[PDB]
Write a protein that binds this DNA or RNA. Structure first.
Ligand SMILES: [Mg+2]
Ligand SMILES: [Mg+2]
Ligand SMILES: [Mg+2]
Ligand SMILES: [Mg+2]
Ligand SMILES: [Mg+2]
Ligand SMILES: [Mg+2]
Ligand SMILES: [Mg+2]
Ligand SMILES: [Mg+2]
Ligand SMILES: [Mg+2]
Ligand SMILES: [Mg+2]
Ligand SMILES: [Mg+2]
Ligand SMILES: [Mg+2]
Ligand SMILES: [Mg+2]
Ligand SMILES: [Mg+2]
Ligand SMILES: [Mg+2]
Ligand SMILES: [Mg+2]
Ligand SMILES: [Mg+2]
Ligand SMILES: [Mg+2]
Ligand SMILES: [Mg+2]
Ligand SMILES: [Mg+2]
Ligand SMILES: [Mg+2]
Ligand SMILES: [Mg+2]
Ligand SMILES: [Mg+2]
Ligand SMILES: [Mg+2]
Ligand SMILES: [Mg+2]
Ligand SMILES: [Mg+2]
Ligand SMILES: [Mg+2]
Ligand SMILES: [Mg+2]
Ligand SMILES: [Mg+2]
Ligand SMILES: [Mg+2]
Ligand SMILES: [Mg+2]
Ligand SMILES: [Mg+2]
Ligand SMILES: [Mg+2]
Ligand SMILES: [Mg+2]
Ligand SMILES: [Mg+2]
Ligand SMILES: [Mg+2]
Ligand SMILES: [Mg+2]
Ligand SMILES: [Mg+2]
Lengths: 98, 96, 136, 48, 170
RNA sequence: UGUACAACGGGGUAUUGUAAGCAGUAGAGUAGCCUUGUUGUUACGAUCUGCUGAGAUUAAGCCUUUGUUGUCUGAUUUGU
RNA sequence: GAAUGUUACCGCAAUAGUAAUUGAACUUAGUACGAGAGGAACAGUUCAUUCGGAUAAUUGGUUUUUGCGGCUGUCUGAUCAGGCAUUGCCGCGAAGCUACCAUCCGCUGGAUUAUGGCUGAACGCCUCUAAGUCAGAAUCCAUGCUAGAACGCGGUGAUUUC
RNA sequence: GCAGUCAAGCGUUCAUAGCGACAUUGCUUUUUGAUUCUUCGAUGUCGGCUCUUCCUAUCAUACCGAAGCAGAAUUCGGUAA
RNA sequence: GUGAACAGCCUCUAGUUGAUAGAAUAAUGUAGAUAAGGGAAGUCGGCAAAAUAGAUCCGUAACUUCGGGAUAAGGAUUGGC
RNA sequence: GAAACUGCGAAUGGCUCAUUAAAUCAGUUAUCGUUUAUUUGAUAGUUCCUUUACUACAUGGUAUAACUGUGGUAAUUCUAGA
């Protein structure tokens, strides 16, 4: 059970809802309702239709805290040193000087 | 979690958003029956045991739902829950 | 449907009554197909026989190589444009009505099928599964 | 009360949709507990 | 689907197999790079945070970071790019690719450990596999041991022992 | 005379697709005053943008409501 | 809908009507039969035709929601906001109605016909028949379903005082 | 128009599996005739559309008996509207 | 005013607001509309209905009495500022 | 000395004669109208910085194949994460 999205409006399409158009090239277009489906048939461009996800993305609308910071990182520092060479003497020959 | 499912699990009831149209909520035990029933919304109905034991294999099939559509019926329904709505929507001129 | 179709076709909305003309989607020289009959169809007075996705018809070629005209041949409907409904609940429609001339056993006269193809049709006729590009 | 859609897997060995999901229409009957207010006995007669 | 996990500290790696949707479904709608808290996927993995690095769907096509989409698409690919090795100078091939967004169609999910858990994992935190080669160029030797430009590398180069029968070499 | 009923108001649901008002270094441009410009200034200019998925409508056979206001004996008839 | 005391609730069932139809594929099976060419069926399964009764989650249609937006002409000085153009025109359009254009559902017992039989005389033999009797059909009767006799009926509640 | 009876013939042989001459007995009233009883102070012609119902001399579907029925197919017949 | 316009549509002056009324919005109608997929299969017959349309520019067949056929056919374009 | 990187080559060769009629091609010109790997000959004291408390020149930076290991697909001179 996938929930698809509207290839025009960017809306979730829950099962058995809206219509599915298979174009000549075999490109499949899914619509949630007859609004997108007609606006699509009219050769409307979603980026010009103010209530569209696509329109909103391009106009930077309401996103906010997805542009705010976060914390994801690590701190590691582990010692392997090398294969076929005794790793015993790899920390004895590494005390550094400076 | 009445309209929830083993595969859905999200706490929600069978009542669509904005309610059932021309009825109400359904705060009591309910019968989900496959297909359509004679009679219209609000009408008293009588459910009655079968008069024969059907070996049909169409009956005898033991169903388990995956999902129960809870989206608004009055208008073209998008969202299942006010939670799920508020998610995709973002924030609006009223809100918190 | 009928001869040579392996399997059973769950009912689909009927979009192609007799006299409809549908694009011929193979390479066999026919430009289009005019439907004069729908195999396996019923009898009810004044109801026009009508075909859907994956249906066997009897057609004539209205435009195409003159060796293909002025005669009857079986044909198979690969594209619909009248939205039907599947059991997975989606209402879907192609952009054109389209078929490909076949024989009584359901073997295409052409070597290829230009354009997509309904799965209900591919499942039903194997030699369509052969010649098909993107299906559904 | 009304009707709504359902999604469930199909168990029908032999079907083309066996084990694939189907969407189906269902109705919901608001069904709070009835209360038992009385009993009525009936006897047979040659008139019924 | 199969999980393929890596521990880029010990150099450890090993796979796993999860069949339950509720276990898996944690990964759905998550992109490549989004972090995952591990108690959801299993009890062993509680405390582990996973990074989603990629994977292959059924039919095997690789994912590609940046596409978004939870499906397969076909792109033009040039040199210096994922899921393609050019055969020829200035050659581009149009190849299928699986999106960066995880889905139930994936046969394998690629994983990388970020934070350790509260429990050790069998072939990951328990075993540690050493780096194959050590420094070769001059100043990188000086930055593995911190020697400045005085200390004279030549004695600090790594030396790997090997045996010819009864002759052990360096 | 109360889990009462109604009229508004609120909240949800839904429909359209961004209201008026103001602001702007947006605007093909264009006029006018001189102190003729080292953004000179004052404006006017389809349209664009921001406040604004805003505004408007939403039971007339949608859902809901602790708020508001009001209503709660007029008429006839019936007996083995 | 008057009248069989009044009013109310729950019921019975006489009579009457009645409904389901046909096909294909898988499998049986390349099987039975045949020299070969050819080539079935019963049980099981998946669908379908024609018909019927519903129903509107979804999809589609419908639009005076004259709900929102857009447009022409003009009229209110401009502005806002509006009027008129026999519902001015256009796109979307909730609700309702609605479509094999949409979805869901369509019961199983008995008695018989033809016909094949049992037992068995007439007619020491013989016979499905004369006496008696078994099996039997898209038939028939019931089950089921729709009315409910406004002159068929039952159980039950409450039954007025100025 | 439909259906019998005799059975000379047909059917490799074989009257009746399926047919049937010469004859002959009948049934039917969607044929056409014959008649002129009703209607000429008026019963609106052909066909189609639409819809109902009835008949059976059954084309299909149910169950059967025959076959010059190996099977497959078909033919004849019965109960059947 | 719009526009080619004494057209249609809106308006000033003037003149009307006369046409039984109230409440509903069943069937069937009369007048006005729309309909997915198909597209004359409807029917005596495309009957009815739909489609076309103004202007500017491009383009334009047979045939001809040389005057035509011709807006042949076929195309592009059109607001605001 | 595999593998792989880096470089160079794959624009030469070979085949065919479809298109092509002032095009091609031929002989004859022009580049004072241009690009040119390679070959061959030449060709470079200048690189920093308010210019004493100096700038790694005894030589500055990582990030990758092969490789190691974990994998995906019925399938390819497919390739993923580490
Ligand atoms: Mg609609
Ligand atoms: Mg007809
Ligand atoms: Mg806005
Ligand atoms: Mg009395
Ligand atoms: Mg077989
Ligand atoms: Mg033989
Ligand atoms: Mg609707
Ligand atoms: Mg308007
Ligand atoms: Mg007028
Ligand atoms: Mg029906
Ligand atoms: Mg029963
Ligand atoms: Mg008897
Ligand atoms: Mg009665
Ligand atoms: Mg009574
Ligand atoms: Mg014989
Ligand atoms: Mg003979
Ligand atoms: Mg003889
Ligand atoms: Mg007369
Ligand atoms: Mg008379
Ligand atoms: Mg008369
Ligand atoms: Mg008469
Ligand atoms: Mg014989
Ligand atoms: Mg009058
Ligand atoms: Mg009037
Ligand atoms: Mg009407
Ligand atoms: Mg319309
Ligand atoms: Mg139409
Ligand atoms: Mg035609
Ligand atoms: Mg005709
Ligand atoms: Mg006709
Ligand atoms: Mg005529
Ligand atoms: Mg005619
Ligand atoms: Mg005529
Ligand atoms: Mg006309
Ligand atoms: Mg139209
Ligand atoms: Mg212009
Ligand atoms: Mg060459
Ligand atoms: Mg780097």
């Amino acid at each position: 059970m996938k929930v698809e999205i509207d290839s025009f409006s960017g809306a979730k399409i829950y099962p058995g809802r809206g219509t599915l158009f298979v174009r000549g090239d075999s490109k499949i277009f899914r619509f949630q309702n007859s609004k997108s489906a007609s606006l699509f048939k009219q050769r409307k461009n979603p980026r010009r239709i103010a209530w569209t996800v696509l329109f909103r993305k391009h106009h930077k609308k309401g996103i906010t805290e997805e542009v705010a910071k976060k914390r994801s990182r690590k701190t590691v520092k582990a010692q392997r040193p090398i294969t076929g060479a005794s790793l015993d003497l790899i920390k004895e020959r590494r005390s550094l000087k400076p | 979690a009445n309209g929830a499912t083993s595969f859905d699990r999200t706490k929600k009831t069978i009542t669509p958003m904005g309610g059932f149209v021309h009825y109400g909520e359904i705060k009591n035990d309910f019968i989900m029956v496959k297909g359509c029933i004679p009679g219209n919304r609000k009408r008293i109905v009588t459910l009655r045991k079968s008069l024969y034991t059907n070996t049909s294999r169409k009956a005898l099939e033991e169903v388990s739902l995956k999902w129960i559509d809870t989206a608004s019926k009055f208008g073209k329904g998008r969202f299942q829950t006010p939670a799920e709505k508020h998610a995709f929507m973002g924030t609006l001129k009223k809100d918190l | 449907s009928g001869n040579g179709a392996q399997g059973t076709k769950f009912r689909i909305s009927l979009g192609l009554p007799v006299g409809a003309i549908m694009n011929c989607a193979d390479n066999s020289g026919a430009r289009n197909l005019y439907i004069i009959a729908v195999k396996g169809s019923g009898s009810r007075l004044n109801r026009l026989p009508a075909a859907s996705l994956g249906d066997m018809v009897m057609a004539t070629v209205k435009k195409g190589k003159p060796e293909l005209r002025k005669k009857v041949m079986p044909a198979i409907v690969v594209r619909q444009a009248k939205s039907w409904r599947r059991r997975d609940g989606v209402f879907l429609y192609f952009e054109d009505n389209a078929g490909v001339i076949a024989n009584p056993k359901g073997e295409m006269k052409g070597s290829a099928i230009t354009g997509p193809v309904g799965k209900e049709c591919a499942d039903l006729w194997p030699r369509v599964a052969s010649n098909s590009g993107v299906v559904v | 009360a009304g009707m709504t859609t359902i999604v469930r897997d199909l168990d029908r060995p032999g079907s083309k949709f066996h084990k694939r999901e189907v969407v189906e229409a269902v109705t919901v009957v608001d069904t709070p507990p009835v209360v038992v207010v009385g009993v009525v006995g009936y006897v047979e007669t040659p008139r019924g | 689907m199969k999980l393929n996990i890596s521990y880029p500290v010990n150099g450890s790696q090993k796979t796993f197999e999860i069949d339950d949707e509720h276990r898996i479904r944690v990964f759905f709608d998550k992109r490549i790079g989004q972090e995952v808290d591990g108690e959801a996927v299993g009890d062993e993995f509680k405390g582990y945070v996973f990074k989603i690095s990629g994977g292959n769907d059924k039919q095997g096509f690789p994912m590609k970071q940046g596409v978004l989409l939870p499906t397969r698409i076909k792109l033009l690919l040039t040199k210096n790019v994922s899921c393609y090795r050019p055969r020829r100078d200035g050659e581009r091939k149009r190849k299928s690719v699986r999106g960066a967004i995880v889905g139930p169609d994936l046969a394998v999910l690629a994983l990388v450990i970020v934070k350790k858990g509260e429990q050790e994992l069998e072939g990951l935190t328990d075993t540690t596999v050493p780096k194959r080669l050590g420094p070769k160029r001059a100043n990188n030797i000086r930055k593995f041991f911190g020697l400045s430009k005085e200390d004279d590398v030549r004695d600090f180069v790594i030396r790997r022992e090997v045996t010819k029968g009864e002759k052990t070499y360096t």
